[PDB]
Amino acid sequence: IVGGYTCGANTVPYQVSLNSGYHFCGGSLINSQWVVSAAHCYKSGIQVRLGEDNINVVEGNEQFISASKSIVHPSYNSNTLNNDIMLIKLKSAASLNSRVASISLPTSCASAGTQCLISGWGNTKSSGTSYPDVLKCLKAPILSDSSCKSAYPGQITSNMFCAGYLEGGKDSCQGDSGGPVVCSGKLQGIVSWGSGCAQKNKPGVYTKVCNYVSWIKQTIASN
Numbered sequence: 001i002v003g004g005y006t007c008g009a010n011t012v013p014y015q016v017s018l019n020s021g022y023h024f025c026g027g028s029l030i031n032s033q034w035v036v037s038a039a040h041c042y043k044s045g046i047q048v049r050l051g052e053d054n055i056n057v058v059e060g061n062e063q064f065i066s067a068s069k070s071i072v073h074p075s076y077n078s079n080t081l082n083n084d085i086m087l088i089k090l091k092s093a094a095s096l097n098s099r100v101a102s103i104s105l106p107t108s109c110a111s112a113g114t115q116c117l118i119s120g121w122g123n124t125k126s127s128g129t130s131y132p133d134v135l136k137c138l139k140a141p142i143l144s145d146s147s148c149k150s151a152y153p154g155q156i157t158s159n160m161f162c163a164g165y166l167e168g169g170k171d172s173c174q175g176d177s178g179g180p181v182v183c184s185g186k187l188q189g190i191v192s193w194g195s196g197c198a199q200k201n202k203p204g205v206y207t208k209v210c211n212y213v214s215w216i217k218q219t220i221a222s223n
């Protein structure tokens with residue numbers, strides 16, 4: 001996250017870190033047994049780490065649980081990143097408490113202009129590399145589809161939306177993929193892609209979760 005701030009320990013209690021010997025993507029806890037992340041974060045051998053603040057220090061509020069199964073969206077296209085969403089089931093149910101909580105799925109899609117909270121342990125430099133060990137947060141509004149499509153011609157589908165600032169300076173970045181975009185208390189997006197980080201007229205692109213609620217609900221109930 002570039003141009004964001006330190007969230008605070010366990011202030012984003014639904015945030016998860018996917019680890020395969022190291023942190024490689026974020027995710028969101030939607031209930032005690034399931035996590036939603038981005039399909040491009042798919043790997044075999046994932047351990048989900050809940051209640052994390054610093055990812056390099058065991059501070060006492062963590063739960064490390066291995067995944068029993070991963071389900072990438074049936075229509076995920078790795079070339080365009082259309083339908084960039086996946087579900088991960090935990091081998092054991094997480095214990096929810098103040099530091100580990102689930103986020104609610106939306107009942108409708110949010111409007112352009114709505115402010116959301118984006119979080120993750122990704123790169124914090126637009127031109128450079130600096131990976132933080134504590135969770136970073138960013139409040140950013142959903143942009144109009146017209147500004148999103150003008151920035152990325154022929155690349156935005158109805159399952160994507162842009163959030164951020166066209167001036168640049170603030171954006172999600174590599175290491176943040178699969179993480180949450182929460183607006184009005186609902187999980188409305190998943191960090192998917194962008195062009196570099198925090199560049200002018202190149203906002204971040206997020207998977208539009210409101211279009212997948214029926215698939216998520218149906219899939220977790222059958223697995």
Ligand SMILES: NC(=[NH2+])c1ccc2[nH]c(-c3ccccc3O)nc2c1
Binds near residue numbers: 172173175176194203
């Ligand atoms: N600028 C952005 N809004 C952004 C967000 C997440 C990203 N994740 C990545 C990424 C790059 C290489 C491999 C995996 C990634 O998730 N680039 C990203 C760019």
Ligand SMILES: [Ca+2]
Binds near residue numbers: 052053055057059
């Ligand atoms: Ca830790």
Ligand SMILES: [Mg+2]
Binds near residue numbers: 027119120175176191
């Ligand atoms: Mg994240």
